Amino acid sequence: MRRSGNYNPSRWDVNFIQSLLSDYKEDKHVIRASELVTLVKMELEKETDQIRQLELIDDLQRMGLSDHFQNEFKEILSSIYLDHHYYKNPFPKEERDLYSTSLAFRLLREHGFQVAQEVFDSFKNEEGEFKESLSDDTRGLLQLYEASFLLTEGETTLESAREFATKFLEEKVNEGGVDGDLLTRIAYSLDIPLHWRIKRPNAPVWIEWYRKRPDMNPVVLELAILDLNIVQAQFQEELKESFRWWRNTGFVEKLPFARDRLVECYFWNTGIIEPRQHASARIMMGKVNALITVIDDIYDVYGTLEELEQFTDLIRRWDINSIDQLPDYMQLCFLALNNFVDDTSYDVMKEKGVNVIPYLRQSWVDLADKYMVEARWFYGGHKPSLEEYLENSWQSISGPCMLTHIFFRVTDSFTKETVDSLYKYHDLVRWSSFVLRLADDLGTSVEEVSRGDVPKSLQCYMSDYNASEAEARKHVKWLIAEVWKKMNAERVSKDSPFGKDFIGCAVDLGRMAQLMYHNGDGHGTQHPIIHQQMTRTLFEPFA
Amino acid sequence: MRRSGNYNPSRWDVNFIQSLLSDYKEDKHVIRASELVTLVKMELEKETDQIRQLELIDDLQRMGLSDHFQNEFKEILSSIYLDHHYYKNPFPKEERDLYSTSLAFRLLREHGFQVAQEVFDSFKNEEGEFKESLSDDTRGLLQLYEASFLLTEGETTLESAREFATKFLEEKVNEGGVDGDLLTRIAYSLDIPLHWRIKRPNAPVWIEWYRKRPDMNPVVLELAILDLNIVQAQFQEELKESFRWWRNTGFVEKLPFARDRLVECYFWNTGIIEPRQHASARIMMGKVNALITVIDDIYDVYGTLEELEQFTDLIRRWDINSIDQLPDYMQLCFLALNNFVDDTSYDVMKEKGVNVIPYLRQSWVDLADKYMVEARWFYGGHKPSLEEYLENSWQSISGPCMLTHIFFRVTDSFTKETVDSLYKYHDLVRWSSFVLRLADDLGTSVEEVSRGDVPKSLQCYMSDYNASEAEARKHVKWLIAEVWKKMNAERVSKDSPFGKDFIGCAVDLGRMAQLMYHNGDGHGTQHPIIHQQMTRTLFEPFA
Ligand SMILES: C=C(F)[C@](C)(CCC=C(C)C)OP(=O)(O)OP(=O)(O)O
Ligand SMILES: C=C(F)[C@](C)(CCC=C(C)C)OP(=O)(O)OP(=O)(O)O
Ligand SMILES: [Mn+2]
Ligand SMILES: [Mn+2]
Ligand SMILES: [Mn+2]
Ligand SMILES: [Mn+2]
Ligand SMILES: [Mn+2]
Ligand SMILES: [Mn+2]
């Protein structure tokens, strides 16, 4: 009679979840690490070779310590940038180096520095093609490929630099060039460039590789391992509170057609809100995400057209005073929602001084509205077209929802204008949700549409230009590259009204999805590799 | 130009309130009692001397074990009552004995058995009047004074009895030293008869008094103390949940003109909802009683007539939209309230299957309205008539709010009909509040008004008949005595839509108020001994 889209039980249960208690929640570490830092710090800024620096910054970064050496990262990069006079389009053609240049470019750009693509010019022959010689320089070559990802449309030099350094890198992988311990790092970046790699869920491995490194330093490595463990604790704390909420709702038993996976839901935020100081957002998100998950299954799995249309209206007019008109299962959910946004608008009001209920309330209305149109197409046995779908797609994924909720928590002082801009669903939001979406649709088009659901990119395209899924798969991949360019441009935009942290969660959300859906769903049914990534960053300690 | 009724700070901090942990929480404790029980349960069901039984029945109760002996109490009093022919219209031939009769009356009536007042007839002399001889049976002359409180208006015999037995008890205490113990355990009942004594916050002293009782049994005395501690742990647990909530609202820092006393607010409930099963109700109430305090201080202390007339109207129409028009502190207060009832109706809707938000909202609306008319008179510099006031007072004290809230968490299943009866504010609710009210107005009269507040019961009588405080004091007391009598008929009523546990809390809310408001202002603000009874009921363990 119904139509449940067969799901599975959260791999982790309360006893484990609710038990969790790492002995890193003590100040002993906090402070040891808090002193071990000042070292790594002064080590850092006592160093002399600018590249030596660029080199540490990237590592400290890829290791999760990014949080403590903030201002260092700046001045260091700040000077370098303008003590190299990187702020000039007209290249001085000092006939620089592929490596240090690819690096200083990468980091500088990543930190919002204007660095003309022209820079990489002193590395190309006459035909304008990249120098033949470069061929021989695996190191710096891998450094350029990696930097060819801080581009925008109208950046052909970076574009091709990538490609050059790509045929190279790969073939060299099949061969060697050097190491064997390079033949992985190289292939590592060659799977997901650093710029598209989310730090947190990836530090460990990086901390390994570094511990190993001969030139490796111990203060740092020690700082690295300690802190990694000092934050795991945090996640564990948050995780529980978010768990407590999930259990309360009782959807798990009162709404079982919906996916049970609150760890997965909380975990996403260990990747999106990297700045540890934002515990609340992380917690909240654990919830926002769970909620969404349930609402989504109610729309594309459980619920009926009648039921949805009405669910969709009640939310629209946020009529809790009719909560008594919907199927009991929709009453529990909506009340839950009402309860969540209301509780959330309270903390925010309590701490920031604003009544944001009218906004958060909106975030949900629109989401649902989008969920609806998909349901209408679906039931209406409708078949959109790549563009038609895509325009709805980036909103039915919740990125905007997830992101508008975060804004209020991550931002310490908003305006109204900002809020308002943000809420037209600011381009940032738009592009960050698009990655989320596309990536998702990449690793979840399968059972998705083959278990009841409207067509997704892959299909929509496949049908659109009557092609193969391999072509569909390629296209979608390309789209993701396009949107990243638009995003890069926006994350660095000066006119951006958003603060560094927020725009930071917008980019990272894109990068998190690129992990989660890099193989499976990490949700619906889950995926080992994902499962492990989770156990290792949420539950297992480091050495 | 606010007013701030200058309050005092909760004598118990965060850390304390947040830490404490009686190991009794350890399951390996329950079971011990779970045996002692079956034991004490047998000594019971194996006893033969009826008077001996009843006797123990009274102890088990007065000691706080009432919870796991219910069905015993039922069978027993049931039988005794039948094989004694208490249901028959008369039976006074002059065979009865003060004691065992004054006692079987009590427990029989108390447990809802209908036993004529004419039983004590067999104890009166010629011109009627209780027999003089028995001016000797001091023992059973206490059991009489004791049962005289299980009356209604139409029962003059019990009225006189109390009149009589006192005359003597009154003196037997100015004797030489019979038992000495007696002297106190007499004067004990003479301060507050047993009927008006909440058991829970009173077991201690009784468990002591019973230890000594040569005619004692150890399995019972052992289960007794064990349970007290096994129970006190519970409270400590519930205590925190409310505390956590209380802390989270941040009223302490944001609504600082409001009384700080969540412990006290939780404590009240240790003695209203006495059946250990209703943990959530006790927990919820920890919050309700808190919301009120705050929302109350907003009305008789801080807030202005513009601000109150508006607070009241919004609450009434209950819209979280116009919320943006309220003064800041009211914005926060309302949202929390909204969140409170909204979160409470959820749990109810969840576990019981119904939407109660519409009824709970009410509970508050009426309270606030009631609180308003008091504000109006006050500012309106109007001095009401004892009755006028009295007609508001029993509602404006929150009794009905407290209770309508309880009802849902205590009642397993109800119906619109019951609910509705309940909400017209059923007599039971009216009686219980009055006691609460008058009792409060006694130990909060000449101290609240003398700092800004409407004239209370006392003061109103005072003017009405232009009498003295003793006359008012005397009246109000008499008044409390009258109400109880209606109460007595309502709790025992066989027409009550209300179910056992609820009817209890209602009765107990009355008795709990006669405790707190006995020495000075119990509740909070500044409790005399009230404090000890609190540390002792919630923090110190028993031998
Ligand atoms: C929960 C998932 F992982 C998604 C992606 C929904 C979006 C919410 C997240 C990621 C917390 O599930 P699903 O792809 O089935 O939703 P969709 O129906 O929009 O495709
Ligand atoms: C304790 C009282 F009965 C109140 C009403 C506060 C609320 C307490 C509960 C629900 C146990 O204190 P107070 O007597 O000062 O209120 P009032 O100003 O109406 O007399
Ligand atoms: Mn969907
Ligand atoms: Mn879905
Ligand atoms: Mn999907
Ligand atoms: Mn008042
Ligand atoms: Mn008051
Ligand atoms: Mn008072």
- In sequence order, the 6+-apart residues with CB closer than 8 A to the CB of B429 are B399, B400, B403, B404, B422, B506
How far is Cα A123 from Cα A409, in angstroms, rounded to an integer? Answer: 45
> Do B156 and B241 sit in the same domain of this protein?
no
Task: Decide: A216 and A209 in contact? Cβ < 8 Å.
Answer: no
Question: Which residue from A97, A91, A93, A108 is spatially nearest to A53, judged by alpha carbons?
Answer: A108
A512 lies in some domain: yes
> Do A149 and A251 sit in the same domain of this protein?
no
- Angle in degrees, 0-180, between the axes of helices A417-425 and A399-410, rounded to the nearest 10: 160
> Do B263 and B174 sit in the same domain of this protein?
no
> Do B191 and B240 sit in the same domain of this protein?
no
DSSP B265-295: HHHHTTTTS-STT-HHHHHHHHHHHHHHHHH
User: Rounded to the nearest 10 degrees, how much is the dihedral formed by the CA atoms of B298, B299, B305, B311?
Assistant: 70
Task: Decide: A337 and A364 in contact? Cβ < 8 Å.
Answer: yes
Which residue in chain A has the smallest CA separation from B321? A358
Report the Cα A470 to chain-centroid distance in Å.
25
- Angle in degrees, 0-180, between the axes of helices B30-45 and B218-249, rounded to the nearest 10: 130
Structure tokens that stand for B31 in this block:
């079971």
Give chain A's radius of gyration (CA, Å): 24
> Do B255 and B378 sit in the same domain of this protein?
yes
- In sequence order, the 6+-apart residues with CB closer than 8 A to the CB of A260 are A7, A8, A9, A10, A252
| DSSP class of A124 | B
Structure tokens that stand for B149 in this block:
């409180």
> The tokens 């998190």 sit on which residue?
A512
Q: Indicate the residue of A332, A350, A355 with minimum beta-carbon distance to B250.
A: A350
In chain A, which residues have their Cβ closer than 8 Å to the Cβ of B251?
none
User: In angstroms, what is the span from residue B445 Cα to ligand 8's centroid?
Assistant: 6
Write out the residue range of the structural domain in which residue A287 sits: 231-543
A1 lies in some domain: no
Task: Decide: B112 and B156 in contact? Cβ < 8 Å.
Answer: no
Looking at the CA of B287, name the nearest ligand: 2
Report the Cα B175 to chain-centroid distance in Å.
33
Q: Measuring from atom 7 of ligand 2, which residue has the nearest CA?
A: B293
Instruction: Give the 3-state secondary structure percentages of chain A, helix then strand then coil, rounded to 5.
Output: 70, 0, 30
Q: Are A342 and B323 inside 8 Å of each other by CB?
A: no
Question: Residue A83 annotated as binding?
Answer: no
B17 lies in some domain: no
Q: Measuring from atom 14 of ligand 2, which residue has the nearest CA?
A: B440
How far is Cα B188 from Cα B181, in angstroms, rounded to an integer? Answer: 10
> Do A357 and A458 sit in the same domain of this protein?
yes
Question: Residue A159 annotated as binding?
Answer: no
> Do B246 and B366 sit in the same domain of this protein?
yes
How far is Cα A105 from Cα A126, in angstroms, rounded to an integer? Answer: 23
**Domain-terminating residue out of B207, B230, B253:** B230
Q: Is B466 exposed, middle or buried (0-12, 13-18, 19+ CB in 10 A)?
A: exposed
Dihedral sign computed on CA atoms, order B538, B539, B540, B542: positive
**How many Cβ atoms are within 10 Å of A166's Cβ, its own excluded?**
16
B21 lies in some domain: no
> Do B223 and B240 sit in the same domain of this protein?
no
Q: Chain A: which residues have CB within 8 Å of chain B?
A: 250, 254, 320-321, 323-324, 328, 331-332, 335-336, 338-339, 342-343, 345-346, 349-350, 355, 357-358
- In sequence order, the 6+-apart residues with CB closer than 8 A to the CB of A219 are A36, A39, A40, A43
Single-letter residue type at A29: H
SS3 B313: helix
Mutate to test the interface with A, among B320, B321, B322, B344 (most CBs of A within 10 A): B320
Q: Give the CATH number for residue A198.
A: 1.50.10.130
User: Rounded to the nearest 10 degrees, how much is the dihedral formed by the CA atoms of A402, A405, A407, A413?
Assistant: 180
Task: Decide: A403 and A430 in contact? Cβ < 8 Å.
Answer: no
* Count: domains in chain A: 2
Task: Decide: B206 and B62 in contact? Cβ < 8 Å.
Answer: yes
Looking at the CA of A397, name the nearest ligand: 1
Dihedral sign computed on CA atoms, order A295, A296, A302, A305: positive
Q: Are B342 and A335 inside 8 Å of each other by CB?
A: yes
CA of B326 to nearest chain A CA: how many angstroms apart? Answer: 11
DSSP B460-477: HHHHHTT--HHHHHHHHH
**Domain-terminating residue out of A190, A209, A230:** A230
User: Rounded to the nearest 10 degrees, how much is the dihedral formed by the CA atoms of A299, A305, A311, A317?
Assistant: 120
Backbone φ and ψ of B355, nearest 5°: -90, 115
Pocket of ligand 1 (CB under 6 A): A 265, 268, 289, 292-293, 296, 300, 396-398, 440, 444, 448, 523-524
B64 lies in some domain: yes
Bridge partner residues of A124 (DSSP): A130
Q: Give the CATH number for residue B362.
A: 1.10.600.10
CA of B244 to nearest chain A CA: how many angstroms apart? Answer: 13
SS3 B334: helix
A529 lies in some domain: yes
CA of A344 to nearest chain B CA: how many angstroms apart? Answer: 10
Query: Which residue numbers of B belong to the known binding site?
Result: 296, 300, 374, 440, 444, 453
Q: Indicate the residue of A254, A320, A349 with minimum beta-carbon distance to B350.
A: A254
For chain A, the residue count is 543
Structure tokens that stand for B144 in this block:
């009489």
Question: Which residue from A408, A394, A368 is spatially nearest to A483, judged by alpha carbons?
Answer: A394
How far is Cα A376 from Cα A379, in angstroms, rounded to an integer? Answer: 5
Report the Cα A109 to chain-centroid distance in Å.
19
B13 lies in some domain: no
Q: Are B357 and A332 inside 8 Å of each other by CB?
A: no
Mutate to test the interface with A, among B335, B340, B356 (most CBs of A within 10 A): B335
> The tokens 């004791």 sit on which residue?
B146
> Do A220 and A267 sit in the same domain of this protein?
no
Which residue in chain B has the smallest CA separation from A336? B346
User: How determined?
Assistant: X-ray
In chain A, which residues have their Cβ closer than 8 Å to the Cβ of B343?
339, 343
**Domain-terminating residue out of A207, A230, A253:** A230
Which residue in chain A has the smallest CA separation from B344? A339
User: In angstroms, what is the span from residue A289 Cα to ligand 1's centroid?
Assistant: 9
Mutate to test the interface with B, among A314, A335, A359 (most CBs of B within 10 A): A335
> Do B276 and B354 sit in the same domain of this protein?
yes
A9 lies in some domain: no
In chain B, which residues have their Cβ closer than 8 Å to the Cβ of A355?
323-324, 331
Q: Indicate the residue of B332, B345, B350 with minimum beta-carbon distance to A349.
A: B332
- Angle in degrees, 0-180, between the axes of helices B416-425 and B399-410, rounded to the nearest 10: 160
> Do B50 and B197 sit in the same domain of this protein?
yes
SS3 A419: helix
Which residue in chain A has the smallest CA separation from B345? A335
| DSSP class of B539 | T
How far is Cα A45 from Cα A52, in angstroms, rounded to an integer? Answer: 10
Mutate to test the interface with A, among B322, B349, B352, B360 (most CBs of A within 10 A): B349
DSSP B106-159: HHHHHTT----GGGGGGGB-TTSSB-SGGGS-HHHHHHHHHHGGG--TT-HHHH
Q: Indicate the residue of B324, B336, B355 with minimum beta-carbon distance to A346.
A: B336
**How many Cβ atoms are within 10 Å of A393's Cβ, its own excluded?**
24
CA of B316 to nearest chain A CA: how many angstroms apart? Answer: 15
Backbone φ and ψ of B130, nearest 5°: -50, 145
Which atom of ligand 1 is nearest the CA belonging to A396?
Answer: 19
Backbone φ and ψ of B390, nearest 5°: -55, -25
How far is Cα B419 from Cα B426, in angstroms, rounded to an integer? Answer: 10
DSSP B78-99: HHHHHTTT-SSS---SS---HH
How far is Cα A259 from Cα A252, in angstroms, rounded to an integer? Answer: 8
How far is Cα B68 from Cα B79, in angstroms, rounded to an integer? Answer: 19
- In sequence order, the 6+-apart residues with CB closer than 8 A to the CB of A435 are A480, A483, A484, A487, A509, A510, A511, A513, A514
Ligand 4 ion: nearby residues, β-carbon < 5 Å? A 296, 300
What residue spans of A176-202 are helical by DSSP H? 185-191
> Do B258 and B224 sit in the same domain of this protein?
no
User: Rounded to the nearest 10 degrees, how much is the dihedral formed by the CA atoms of A317, A321, A327, A328?
Assistant: 130
Which residue in chain B has the smallest CA separation from A335? B346
Q: What is the resolution of this structure in A?
A: 2.7
User: In angstroms, what is the span from residue B431 Cα to ligand 7's centroid?
Assistant: 20
